[PDB]
Amino acid sequence: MLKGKVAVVTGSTSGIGLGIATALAAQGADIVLNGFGDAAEIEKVRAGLAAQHGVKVLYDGADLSKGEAVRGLVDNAVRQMGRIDILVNNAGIQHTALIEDFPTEKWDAILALNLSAVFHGTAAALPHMKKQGFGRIINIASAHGLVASANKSAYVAAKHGVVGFTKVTALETAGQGITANAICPGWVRTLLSEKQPSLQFVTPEQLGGTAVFLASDAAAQITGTTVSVDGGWTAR
Amino acid sequence: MLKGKVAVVTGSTSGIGLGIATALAAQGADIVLNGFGDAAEIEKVRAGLAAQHGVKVLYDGADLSKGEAVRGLVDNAVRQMGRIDILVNNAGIQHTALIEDFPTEKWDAILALNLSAVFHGTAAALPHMKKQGFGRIINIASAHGLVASANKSAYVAAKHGVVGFTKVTALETAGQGITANAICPGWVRTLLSEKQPSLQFVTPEQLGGTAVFLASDAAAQITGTTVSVDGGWTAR
Amino acid sequence: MLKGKVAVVTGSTSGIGLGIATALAAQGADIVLNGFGDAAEIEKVRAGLAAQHGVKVLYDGADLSKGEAVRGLVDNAVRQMGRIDILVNNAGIQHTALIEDFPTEKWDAILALNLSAVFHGTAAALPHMKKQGFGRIINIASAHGLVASANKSAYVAAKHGVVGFTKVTALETAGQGITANAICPGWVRTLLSEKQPSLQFVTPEQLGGTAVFLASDAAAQITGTTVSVDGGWTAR
Amino acid sequence: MLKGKVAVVTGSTSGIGLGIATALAAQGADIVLNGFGDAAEIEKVRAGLAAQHGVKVLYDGADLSKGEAVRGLVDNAVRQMGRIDILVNNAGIQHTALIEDFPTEKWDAILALNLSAVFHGTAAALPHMKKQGFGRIINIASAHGLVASANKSAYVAAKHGVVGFTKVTALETAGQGITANAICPGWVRTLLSEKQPSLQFVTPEQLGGTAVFLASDAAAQITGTTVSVDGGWTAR
Ligand SMILES: NC(=O)c1ccc[n+]([C@@H]2O[C@H](COP(=O)([O-])OP(=O)(O)OC[C@H]3O[C@@H](n4cnc5c(N)ncnc54)[C@H](O)[C@@H]3O)[C@@H](O)[C@H]2O)c1
Ligand SMILES: NC(=O)c1ccc[n+]([C@@H]2O[C@H](COP(=O)([O-])OP(=O)(O)OC[C@H]3O[C@@H](n4cnc5c(N)ncnc54)[C@H](O)[C@@H]3O)[C@@H](O)[C@H]2O)c1
Ligand SMILES: NC(=O)c1ccc[n+]([C@@H]2O[C@H](COP(=O)([O-])OP(=O)(O)OC[C@H]3O[C@@H](n4cnc5c(N)ncnc54)[C@H](O)[C@@H]3O)[C@@H](O)[C@H]2O)c1
Ligand SMILES: NC(=O)c1ccc[n+]([C@@H]2O[C@H](COP(=O)([O-])OP(=O)(O)OC[C@H]3O[C@@H](n4cnc5c(N)ncnc54)[C@H](O)[C@@H]3O)[C@@H](O)[C@H]2O)c1
Ligand SMILES: C[As](C)(=O)[O-]
Ligand SMILES: C[As](C)(=O)[O-]
Ligand SMILES: C[As](C)(=O)[O-]
Ligand SMILES: C[As](C)(=O)[O-]
Ligand SMILES: [Mg+2]
Ligand SMILES: [Mg+2]
Ligand SMILES: [Mg+2]
Ligand SMILES: [Mg+2]
Numbered sequence A, B, C, D: 001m002l003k004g005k006v007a008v009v010t011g012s013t014s015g016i017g018l019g020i021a022t023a024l025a026a027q028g029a030d031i032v033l034n035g036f037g038d039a040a041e042i043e044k045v046r047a048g049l050a051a052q053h054g055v056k057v058l059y060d061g062a063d064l065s066k067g068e069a070v071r072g073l074v075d076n077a078v079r080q081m082g083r084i085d086i087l088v089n090n091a092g093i094q095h096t097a098l099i100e101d102f103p104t105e106k107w108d109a110i111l112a113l114n115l116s117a118v119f120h121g122t123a124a125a126l127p128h129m130k131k132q133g134f135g136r137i138i139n140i141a142s143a144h145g146l147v148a149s150a151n152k153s154a155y156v157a158a159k160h161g162v163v164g165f166t167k168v169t170a171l172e173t174a175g176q177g178i179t180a181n182a183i184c185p186g187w188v189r190t191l192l193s194e195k196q197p198s199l200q201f202v203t204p205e206q207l208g209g210t211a212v213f214l215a216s217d218a219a220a221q222i223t224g225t226t227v228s229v230d231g232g233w234t235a236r
Helices: A015-026 A039-053 A067-079 A102-134 A153-173 A204-215 B015-026 B039-053 B068-082 B103-134 B153-173 B204-215 C014-027 C040-051 C067-081 C104-132 C153-173 C204-215 D015-026 D039-053 D067-081 D104-132 D153-173 D204-215
Strands: A006-009 A032-033 A057-060 A084-090 A133-141 A176-183 A226-229 B006-009 B030-034 B056-058 B086-089 B134-142 B178-185 B226-229 C006-009 C031-032 C057-060 C086-089 C135-140 C177-187 C226-229 D006-008 D030-034 D057-059 D084-088 D135-140 D178-185 D226-229
Touching: A006 A015, A006 A067, A006 C226, A006 D006, A015 A039, A015 A084, A015 A133, A015 D039, A032 A039, A032 A067, A032 B178, A039 A057, A057 A067, A057 D084, A067 A102, A084 B204, A102 A133, A102 A153, A102 A176, A102 C057, A102 C153, A102 C177, A102 D039, A133 A153, A133 A204, A153 A176, A153 C104, A176 A204, A204 A226, A204 B204, A226 B178, B006 B068, B015 B030, B015 B086, B030 B039, B030 B068, B030 D153, B039 B056, B056 B068, B056 B153, B068 B103, B086 B103, B086 C014, B103 B134, B103 B153, B103 B178, B103 D104, B134 B153, B134 B204, B153 B178, B153 D153, B178 B204, B178 C204, B178 D006, B226 C204, C006 C014, C006 C067, C006 D135, C014 C031, C014 C040, C014 C086, C014 C135, C014 C204, C031 C040, C031 C067, C040 C057, C040 D178, C067 C104, C104 C135, C104 C153, C104 C177, C104 D135, C135 C204, C135 D067, C153 C177, C177 C204, C204 C226, D006 D015, D006 D067, D015 D030, D015 D039, D015 D084, D015 D135, D015 D204, D030 D039, D030 D067, D057 D067, D067 D104, D084 D104, D104 D135, D104 D178, D135 D153, D153 D178, D178 D204
Parallel strands: A006 A032, A006 A084, A032 A057, A084 A133, A133 A176, A176 A226, B006 B030, B006 B086, B030 B056, B086 B134, B134 B178, B178 B226, C006 C031, C006 C086, C031 C057, C086 C135, C135 C177, C177 C226, D006 D030, D006 D084, D030 D057, D084 D135, D135 D178, D178 D226
Antiparallel strands: none
16 A cells, blocks of 8 residues: 555546556555646546545646746645655657658657656655655656657657656666656557557556556565556567 | 466475465465475475465476476466466576586576476466466566676576567467566575665565566556566666 | 768767768768867868868758757758768767756756757758658667666656657658668767776777768668667676 | 688578678688588589689588587687687577467477577687687577567577577677677568568678678677667567
8 A cells, every 4th residue: 555655646637647646546645636627627536536535635737848837746745745755757748740740849849748847857856755765756658668650759759768767767766765667558548450469458547556566665676667568569 | 366366386485486476375366386495394385375375275396497397287287276377487597607618508407497498388378378368477587688697698598588488478369368478587685786776685575566466457458578676777 | 882972960070970970971972060169170170071082071060959950951961962861960968967956957958959959850851861762860879878877867868769769760761762770879988897898988980880881771771770889888 | 801800600501691601701701601401502602602702611511400510610610710700690490380389399499599509609609709809799680589479489589599698798708809799680581561661671681781890890899789670670
């Protein structure tokens, strides 16, 4: 279980992020939700999770495309929750186009959220985790952080960047009770034959369970690595 | 939990294998122990695990250096336990020497146990897992299945072979309710500064927890991949 | 040889880039130099290369930290040289610091030059290479595009990004007479015991020879991959 | 060029091996051919290469499935040629079948030739290369030494083993004027849409050129790595 621990999950108002926040809440961890969406429905989700799992759940709608906002998300999480044991950098966007047709605006946006937000969030969380003597940074990369697909240059570059950044985070925190790993999902229903051998989608629940495992003490020495949840995508 | 499931763990009379068998037993899975060692003490371990976790535990001392013996281990596990849901190919040996000084006898022995035994065990288990519609093959490779170290040619070659074999197993079983993955441990106290950034040993308990996770339904789409538990070894 | 071909090498006013531009010039390719430095001495280098190898050599001091300037470098190379057969994205910078102490300004600068410049340059060159039916994009990444080192978060993230971007470039151009690969150097004298097994530095001349090989017809089917020139860095 | 150097290429009576031996001969290196086939036609090939390139070419039909025969091939190469600067471990076989249907005889044969022969050959060559202060071991692995395909368990395991063994060889010889690398080819016409993005076959000539490059001084610091020549196979 994760009772007494605080988890911040970026982009948890829906999809994979919500699945991960839900799984962590079920383990007894207090949660800080984040992401865009309908204010009224987000409040329903927040209140629902808190009541269903008997944990404290807050919502911070910080726009993670801005570095100071990402750092602020972490700062306020610590101020209101008292600490930050788990940081799940999940928020992300995408865009398909040939490299020569790829809008610079889209390239910049994808790198800002999919990669730089991981840097800013990690930077703000580390001082706390080092002092606490405990930390779990779980970055949601992609199979595209390990291999590529045509027409997804910005996304693949950003995700590969996340994988590298994860490794550095791990090396800088090695032995300090902190681990940093990157979950690399294949397709999630948030087509299969071309990339996913199992011909089965990965689910937010499975990814939540994977995050829960990485947050456990059994994973104390799992650091600076990738955990592929892709139905065989990267095996071939 | 894993109630109603049967797990065969090779080389589980001590070290990592025993830790994995213990973790699986604690989840409610019936266990088939295997490996060399003292008959009287092995019986004590077997009886102890069965009583402590309320599961059926058997011991088969098959010499896995012989292909037919490995296949026999699986055949008898099914005959006595009724099925084989989880196969942990863990038994292994090592030998240090420069390539030009490496005894052919040692090269052959390491490949036979560290690599070929995985093939024979997997081959015998697959028909059952495919019919059952459920299977979890967990191969204990090593950080040396991904990177190398001087003077460990046979071991590194064998472990890399296991990683490749694991990927093939996954592709051949994709979507059939079966997964095949390779846990790649760093140092386990069964020196650290040179290879393991955390400067902390990996434990049999942690590896057992990792095996338990891979055996869970949350890991249904984790297949054909490696899970490094090495304190940062492969991150640098 | 590369007679009749045009090569643009970013950051070729010194170090690795100059070594690569020199090697390509020796193969008979026309060259477009680029980078910061002393105008008078750069002219001496430019004039020297042209006279020594009997090829056309131009210099464009475009500041590659700006996307439009990178695209302009390629546009003008085509206008003055008539085409662009080889694009070597080499310019890069670095900065050491713990993640929590890493200046956002430095993070942004490193990503802009080490990663985004590869995108902008590649984007501008592709239309030409596709029409020509020939292209060689050679990205100078680093061993740090495959593994990490503590205190180099921005650099490692950017270099990993380059590796991923290289793979996408290759997939989008597959079969069109164009290849895209990433040379990943270890230490170059532009300390060794910790990362480089050979205990020998990699030289600009060796990297130039590696670029020459990738530009050759023998490397027509080498695409979307990395070529490590690191004295064993990534083997362990 | 490679004048004054001796190269031994296993399985060079046809296909990739012959292409590599031919390329090396064109660089001025003396050659030792090896492999099965028609004695009369092999002699024609041998005599032809020697006359066409003005180098010494011998043929040794050692059956590399036997360790002592592999070591003998190297021993006799040194006795008749005076030294062994380049060793290309290329001979290999294959077999397709599901793991549970894979004949143990075929599994053993593939491991013996595709993997163990690399060990025996390397072991016999190393003492000479270390004394000479120069060595180039070029192992012909496959894309299947890095990724897998269903129904090729023995081959994939063996090729992954070769990649690992190559890394160890490099680490044990680091800085001694010796390098060890593994060329990993995609399809060679010795179907494409499923695995090879370029939709173009790799040729023996291209692989020969790749071997020539690795044998050059420019590749002095390229060691313990893989060089994929696969038209994009491993990029996705
Ligand atoms: N869906 C897949 O197949 C898949 C598989 C591999 C990896 N991933 C990764 O999973 C992560 C989550 O994506 P998803 O598939 O669940 O999609 P999603 O749209 O369901 O979730 C993305 C979340 O990001 C938040 N978000 C977007 N921009 C933001 C910003 N500027 N600031 C703050 N929050 C922002 C959204 O509000 C949303 O909650 C992404 O990083 C994605 O790249 C997805
Ligand atoms: N200890 C580490 O640092 C470490 C880290 C990476 C991977 N590994 C892998 O973990 C596995 C277990 O090794 P360990 O470290 O627990 O050592 P160990 O000696 O404690 O356990 C090895 C087990 O293998 C069994 N065994 C040996 N030969 C056998 C044979 N011919 N037939 C049947 N059983 C046989 C033994 O009886 C024993 O129970 C090995 O595959 C090893 O390569 C070890
Ligand atoms: N030196 C090493 O050990 C090593 C090994 C791995 C990879 N690399 C990579 O090699 C590449 C070249 O670096 P180097 O080691 O030769 O260093 P260097 O300083 O000798 O060369 C860098 C070049 O980049 C140019 N440059 C810098 N900023 C620029 C800008 N904004 N616009 C245009 N040009 C700019 C410089 O003028 C210079 O010619 C870099 O991408 C680096 O990351 C270096
Ligand atoms: N053809 C491809 O698509 C491809 C791509 C990836 C890697 N490879 C590798 O390339 C290598 C060469 O195979 P190829 O495709 O040129 O096939 P090939 O049949 O044309 O060549 C194989 C060579 O191995 C020799 N050989 C076989 N068994 C032997 C033994 N017991 N002793 C001595 N020599 C023996 C043969 O006589 C022959 O010259 C193999 O290792 C193969 O796995 C092939
Ligand atoms: C949505 As995806 C598989 O490109 O990360
Ligand atoms: C015992 As080990 C780290 O070589 O697998
Ligand atoms: C200068 As480096 C080895 O960090 O790329
Ligand atoms: C002949 As092959 C591509 O399996 O090495
Ligand atoms: Mg509303
Ligand atoms: Mg006794
Ligand atoms: Mg001046
Ligand atoms: Mg005849």
